[PDB]
Amino acid sequence: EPLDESSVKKMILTFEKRSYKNQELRIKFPDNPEKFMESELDLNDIIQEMHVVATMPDLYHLLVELNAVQSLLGLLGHDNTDVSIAVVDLLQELTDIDTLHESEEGAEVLIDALVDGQVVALLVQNLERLDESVKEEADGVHNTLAIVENMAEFRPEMCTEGAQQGLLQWLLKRLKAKMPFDANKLYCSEVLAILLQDNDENRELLGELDGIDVLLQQLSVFKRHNPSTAEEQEMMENLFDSLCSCLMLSSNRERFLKGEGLQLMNLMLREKKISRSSALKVLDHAMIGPEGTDNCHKFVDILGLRTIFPLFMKSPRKIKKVGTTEKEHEEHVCSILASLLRNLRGQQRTRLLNKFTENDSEKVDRLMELHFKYLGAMQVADKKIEGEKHDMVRRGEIIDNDTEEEFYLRRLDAGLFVLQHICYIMAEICNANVPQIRQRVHQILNMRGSSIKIVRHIIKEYAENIGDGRSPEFRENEQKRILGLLENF
C-alpha cells in the first residue's frame, strides 16, 4: 500500500546520492577493466523503486524543483544502455499515468521540465545508440515512442520542437529499414502520424527529407495485394493517415507529383481491394484547392476519369468489414470532382465536361439523385436542431459557441460537406455554356419541389466559410469567384 507524504523526498535524495556515488566510481576505475557496474546496479534498482512514484497521487512538483528530472536525462546519456533503458522505461510510466486529470499540476510542471530539458533530442540520441534488437534494446525503443505518444497526446503544442530534434529523421530511417516488420515499426507510424497530425512545420520537414517518397514506397508494396496480418493493415492505414496529412501542406503537392503518386493511388483503385478506400482519400487530398492544379491535370492525363466516374455512378459494398462506407466514399468522390471542376482548364477540362454530357448526361441524372438524397437528410437534421434551439429557450439554456459546434457535427454527420460539393459541382457545370446540362439540372429541380434558391443558400454557406482559413485575400478572392457562378446559374 502506498501512502507517503514526501517519502518520495527520501527517494529523490537517495537517487541523487546514488547517482553521485556512481559518477565518482566512474571516475575512479574508469579504464577498460571494470569495477563500476556493481555501483550501476545499485543505482538503477533505485530508479526502479522510484518507478512507483507515478502511482502516488502525483505531487510531481517535487521531481522538477529538486532536479530529479534534470539528473535523469544525463542518465539518458550514460555508457551502459541498461541505465538508459531503465530511465526511458521509468519515464514511460510517469507519463502514461499523468493523463489522468489528477495532478495536472505536477504534469504541467513535470511536462514543462522535460520539454525545457530537450527530452526528445536526448531521447533520440539514446535511440540512436540502441542498435541491434536486443529484446531489451527493442523494448527500449518502444518505450521511447511511448513517451512521445503520451507527451504528444497531453500537450500537443510540444510536437514541433520534437520534430526539429531529429525524431522525424529517425522515424523515417526506421520505416525505410529493410528489417522484417514487427510491432516497433508499427508503432513508429502511429507516432509519425501523431507528429504530423495537425502540424504544418512537421509537414514542411517530412517533405524536405524525401519523406513522401518513403511513404509512397512503403505503401507501394501493398499495391497489388492486402496486408498479410490485420496488424500490418493497421500500419498501412497509419502510412496513409500520415501521407494525407502531408498533402494538406501545399508544397508536398509538388513532391507528391514527382513521386508517381497518382499512378499508385490510381493503380490501388483499379485493383479494387482493400487499400482502395484509402487511396481515394489521398487522391482527393492531392487535388483539393489551387496547389492541386498540376495534379488535377496529371490525373486526367492518366485516364483518371475512367477510374473516378464509375465510383461516382455506383458505390459499394453494403458493406465491407473494414469500414469506408456510404457518405464517406461519396464525399471523397464528389470533393475530387469539385476540385477538378474548379481547377481544370484547357484540354483536360473539356474531357471532364464531356463525361457530364454522356449517355444523355446520365451523370447529371446521378448528381441530382445524390443531391436530393443528401438534402432530405440535411433538411430533417436541421428540423431537429431548430427544435432544440426553441427547447433551449424555454429551458433558458443559451446557445453559445460550444452548442453551435455540437450542432455543426450533426450537419456534417448528415453529409453537409458532400451536399455543398454537389451543389458547387452542379453550379460549376451550369456555367460551362452547355445547354443540355443546365436544362436538365433545372428540368429535374422543378420535377419536383426543389427551388434553385434552396441551392443558392447552400452555396452562400459553402462560400462564407469557404477557405478556412487561407489568406483573407485568398479567402475573399475565392468567395467572390464562387458567388460569381451564382449569377449565370
Q: Which residues in this chain contact its own copies in the complex, by CB under 8 A?
A: 9, 13, 16, 20, 23-24, 27, 30, 65-67, 70, 74, 77, 116, 118, 121-122, 125, 164
Q: Residue 67 or 477: which CB sits closer to its own copies?
A: 67
Q: How many Å is the Cα radius of gyration of the chain?
A: 28
Closest contact distance (angstroms) between CB of 43 and its own copies is 14
CA quadruple 176, 181, 185, 189: dihedral sign: positive
Closest contact distance (angstroms) between CB of 29 and its own copies is 13
Q: Residue 114 or 280: which CB sits closer to its own copies?
A: 114
Contact 470, 392 (CB under 8 A): no
Contact 53, 8 (CB under 8 A): yes
Long-range contacts of 113-118 (CB under 8 A, 24+ apart): 113/63, 113/64, 113/69, 113/70, 114/69, 114/151, 115/151, 115/155, 115/158, 115/161, 117/69, 117/70, 117/73, 118/161, 118/165
DSSP string of 57-87, one letter each residue? ---THHHHHTTHHHHHHHHHT-SSHHHHHHH
Closest contact distance (angstroms) between CB of 34 and its own copies is 16
Closest contact distance (angstroms) between CB of 193 and its own copies is 23
Closest contact distance (angstroms) between CB of 220 and its own copies is 25
| Assigned C-alpha cell, 184 | 516497433
CA dist list (Å): 125 to 10, 64, 95, 357: 31, 22, 20, 61
Q: Residue 65 or 406: which CB sits closer to its own copies?
A: 65
Closest contact distance (angstroms) between CB of 17 and its own copies is 8
Q: Residue 167 or 305: which CB sits closer to its own copies?
A: 167
Contact 330, 312 (CB under 8 A): no
Q: How many residues does the chain have?
A: 489
Nearest residue to 282 (alpha-carbon basis) of 333, 221, 240: 240
Q: Residue 13 or 100: which CB sits closer to its own copies?
A: 13
If you ran DSSP here, which 8-state letter would residue 164 be given?
Answer: I
Q: Residue 61 or 456: which CB sits closer to its own copies?
A: 61
Q: Residue 80 or 164: which CB sits closer to its own copies?
A: 164
Closest contact distance (angstroms) between CB of 67 and its own copies is 6
Furthest CA-CA distance within the chain: 94
Q: Residue 28 or 306: which CB sits closer to its own copies?
A: 28
Closest contact distance (angstroms) between CB of 161 and its own copies is 8
Q: Report phi then psi at 427, rounded to 5.
A: -75, -40
Burial class of 364 by CB neighbour count within 10 A (0 to 12, 13 to 18, 19+): buried
| Assigned C-alpha cell, 64 | 522538477
Q: Residue 114 or 418: which CB sits closer to its own copies?
A: 114
Closest contact distance (angstroms) between CB of 301 and its own copies is 20
Closest contact distance (angstroms) between CB of 479 and its own copies is 22
Nearest residue to 374 (alpha-carbon basis) of 311, 327, 342: 327
- Number of Cβ atoms within 10 Å of the Cβ of 178: 5
Q: Residue 169 or 357: which CB sits closer to its own copies?
A: 169
Q: How far is it, in rounded angstroms, from Cα 202 to Cα 162?
A: 9
Closest contact distance (angstroms) between CB of 73 and its own copies is 8
**Helix and strand element counts for the chain (H, E):** 27, 0
Q: Residue 106 or 304: which CB sits closer to its own copies?
A: 106
